[PDB]
């Protein structure tokens, strides 16, 4: 294998068709190579088109102005576009699972979505306000984000402990395993399932018989779970009340149960009441803690800073997956640093994500580099935004994809770029357009209409010169 040979590689005009070869004796094969992790699927271009529509439709609102309703109405539409983006991506992920299965691309797209769910939950619902401003929407997004990030508790683990595997004479729920999985369910808002795992073993059994006192706790506790408030921050204020009353009553009362079963029920009640110490104890990952704190302790984003800190002291960020850290960054205020990671999962999603974050005004162009200026074409630099940068890159990337359907997206993206001289753009289009993969008459007319719209005379003149030889002699 280790023969030092002269390998040569040439990138082709088409992303999906490059070439490798070797200048050595008895090595006369040509190896067509396509760029690693490239999306050629129809599902993808649909996604791209879908996202471009939202971008185009955002109109003046894709920009953020650093009449009292313009503020409120602006967020209204931006927050909706965010939902649109999320939707388009779910659909995409869907069509990908059906077509190719749970491949490497599927995993990355979900990760990309998880980071987006988290982003929406934190900045595209409350608009800087607190959970009381809209308890329903918030908790919904939160509970959704959490239960789509990872699979656990996977039902393949539910049966794992209900294995009915009796090996020091287990009482089916006197096991520490049972409870952790009950609290876990609660911490994740998965109350329905939580209730089920209880009505599974000793609701009426060991309890309705052994200790009639604790039977009442474990029962009307399940009752409170059944009505955890998700719309009125008032109803919650009163909910946490009955819960704290319950934990106190039971706290000092008739102990007609095992020494362990005694506590295993207090803890269950403590967690539901919001005991910080406990919510951390039965949390497997930082995000279970973070989620719990908001659900059972105090539902205020003014404490997220603290919640996140405590959560991470309990369970560190798991570097296995690429989404956890970006979420930690989102929650902790530094949004800008999720872009590099998302750009790795999918260039497209990252591009538009950065875009809508600029629309919301969560990231802006801090740049200012001249008092002496007037050629410095920079449509593609750090001079303008971090968003402008990412959108423009995506445009260029689309040009080598060779899909004539997306070329309009590419050019449109460049044309609508909220930054850069009309002349700077003119030049960029002047160089890209000639590469448009036209075939139809309608295709050619499109090229021309763009030469008109931008006044690229000497370019419509070459398109036609290629045409004088591929249009005056081709469509024969």
């Amino acid at each position: 294998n280790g023969d030092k040979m002269p390998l040569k590689f040439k990138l082709g005009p088409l992303s999906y068709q490059n070439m490798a070869f070797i200048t050595a004796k008895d090595k006369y094969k040509l190896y067509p190579v396509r760029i690693p992790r490239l999306d050629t699927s129809k599902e993808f271009s649909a996604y791209v088109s879908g996202l471009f529509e939202i971008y185009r439709d955002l109109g003046d609102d894709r920009v953020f102005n650093v009449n009292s309703n313009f503020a409120k109405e602006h967020n209204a539409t931006v927050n909706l576009a965010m939902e649109a983006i999320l939707n388009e991506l779910e659909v995409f992920i869907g069509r990908v699972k059906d077509q190719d299965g749970r491949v490497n691309r599927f995993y990355e797209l979900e990760e990309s979505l998880t980071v987006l769910n988290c982003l929406r939950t934190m900045y595209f619902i409350l608009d800087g306000q607190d959970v009381e401003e809209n308890r329903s929407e918030f908790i919904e997004s939160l509970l959704n984000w959490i239960n789509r990030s990872d699979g656990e508790p996977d039902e393949e683990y539910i049966e794992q402990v209900f294995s009915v595997k009796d090996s020091a004479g287990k009482k089916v729920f006197e096991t520490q395993y049972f409870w952790k999985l009950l609290n876990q369910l609660v911490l994740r808002g998965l109350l329905s399932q939580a209730i089920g795992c209880i009505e599974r073993s000793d609701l009426l059994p060991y309890l309705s018989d052994t200790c009639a006192v604790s039977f009442d706790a474990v029962s009307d506790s399940i009752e409170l779970l059944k009505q955890y408030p998700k719309d009125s921050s008032s109803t919650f204020r009163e909910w946490k009340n009955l819960v704290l009353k319950l934990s106190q009553a039971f706290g000092s009362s008739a102990t007609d149960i095992s020494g362990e079963l005694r506590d295993y029920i207090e803890d269950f009640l403590l967690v539901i009441g919001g005991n910080q110490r406990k919510i951390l104890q039965y949390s497997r990952t930082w995000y279970e803690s973070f989620c719990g704190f908001l659900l059972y302790y105090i539902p205020s984003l003014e404490l997220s800073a603290e919640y996140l800190q405590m959560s991470l002291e309990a369970n560190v960020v798991d570097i296995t997956n690429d989404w956890e850290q970006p979420c930690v960054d989102i929650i902790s205020g530094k949004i800008h640093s999720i872009l590099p990671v998302m750009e790795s999962l999918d260039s497209c999603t990252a591009a538009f994500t950065a875009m809508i974050c600029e629309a919301k005004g969560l990231i802006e162009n801090i740049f200012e580099g001249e008092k002496n200026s007037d050629m410095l074409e920079d449509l593609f630099s750090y001079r303008n935004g971090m968003a402008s940068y990412m959108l423009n890159s995506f445009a260029f990337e689309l040009c080598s994809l060779g899909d004539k359907e997306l070329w309009p997206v590419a050019i449109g993206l460049i044309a609508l770029s909220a930054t850069g001289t009309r002349s700077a753009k003119k030049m960029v289009i002047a160089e890209l357009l000639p590469h448009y993969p036209f075939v139809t008459n309608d295709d050619i007319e499109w090229m021309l209409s763009i030469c008109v719209e931008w006044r690229l005379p000497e370019i419509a003149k070459e398109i036609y010169t290629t045409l004088g030889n591929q249009m005056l002699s081709a469509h024969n």
Partner: protein, 306 residues
């Protein structure tokens, strides 16, 4: 995702493979003195030989396609001290060996030729070549109707005294693609690498050098500067390093942006994107690396093919 490799059909080693403007065609040249052209069938996404033919009396080292706005034209450089130009005659069967007619021959070179590159279309059918004689030569098809009317536009001594020993020599060319930038081209000759620019006097003058190379420069290519104001040219040296130079004209400034030895051995091929967005490098390690620029303008390896 690797695709089904295929045989070129060459007996002796293959030196260069080049894409046409649209990326649907490829031209190959080897030591067996043949030039093969492959077509990418629309229906069955396979590469299939369009035509092969004997074109030189010696080993063919370089090749290149002209802008489509001048027709279907390929140019070849061989160790037989010549450069030949061909034009496809669509009225011939493919694989007939007679699908490409020689349009001319350039014999001015008195030493073998290592490279030939057409100039950016916005300058007309023009081209350059460099060989053992250490003399770069530019040719112009003054009258775009007579694709035989190839006049000699310029001659420059890259090496004052061409060493001329143990043919342990290398030369490369690469024009600045830029449409909105003054005509200029890069040239590598052994350890040196220099840039030429057209003057107000219509003559080439040396406008700068890309310092730092501590061995033979195997490859160099100017990147498409779409969007940017500056220029970027990369070089794959024998000392095992990829280098990317930022050239600004405020006449020309020269910054070194990145150096990469990830290859641990000689970098044979260095290539660019159509947008100059991705840069490729290949070498001894038998690996191809793709590089993207950071937001800070540094370059990062976005993938390693093998």
């Amino acid at each position: 995702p690797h695709m089904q490799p295929f045989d070129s059909g060459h007996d002796d080693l293959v030196h260069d493979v080049v894409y046409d403007f649209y990326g649907r065609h490829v031209a190959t040249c080897s030591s067996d003195q043949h030039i093969k052209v492959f077509k990418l069938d629309k229906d069955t996404s396979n590469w299939e030989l369009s035509d092969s033919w004997r074109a030189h009396d010696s080993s063919i080292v370089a090749i290149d396609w002209a802008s489509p706005e001048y027709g279907r034209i390929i140019a070849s450089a061989s160790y037989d001290k010549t450069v030949k130009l061909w034009e496809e005659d669509p009225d011939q069967e493919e694989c007939s060996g007679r699908r490409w007619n020689k349009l001319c021959t350039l014999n001015d070179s008195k030493g073998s030729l290592y490279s030939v590159k057409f100039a950016p279309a916005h300058l007309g059918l023009k081209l350059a070549c460099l060989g053992n004689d250490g003399i770069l030569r530019l040719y112009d098809a003054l009258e775009p109707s007579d694709l035989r009317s190839w006049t000699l536009t310029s001659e420059m001594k890259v090496l004052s005294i061409p060493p001329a020993n143990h043919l342990q020599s290398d030369f490369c060319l690469s024009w600045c693609p830029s449409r909105f930038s003054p005509e200029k081209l890069a040239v590598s000759a052994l350890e040196q690498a220099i840039i030429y620019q057209r003057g107000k006097d219509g003559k080439l003058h040396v406008a700068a050098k890309l310092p730092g190379h501590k061995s033979l420069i195997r490859s160099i290519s100017w990147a498409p500067s779409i969007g940017r104001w500056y220029q970027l040219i990369a070089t794959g040296c024998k000392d095992g390093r990829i280098r990317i130079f930022k050239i600004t004209e405020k006449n020309l400034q020269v910054e070194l942006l990145s150096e990469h030895d990830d290859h641990n051995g000689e970098v044979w091929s260095v290539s660019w994107n159509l947008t100059g967005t991705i840069l490729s490098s290949a070498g001894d390690d038998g690996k191809v690396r793709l590089w993207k620029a950071t937001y800070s303008n540094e370059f990062k390896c976005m993938s390693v093919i093998t």
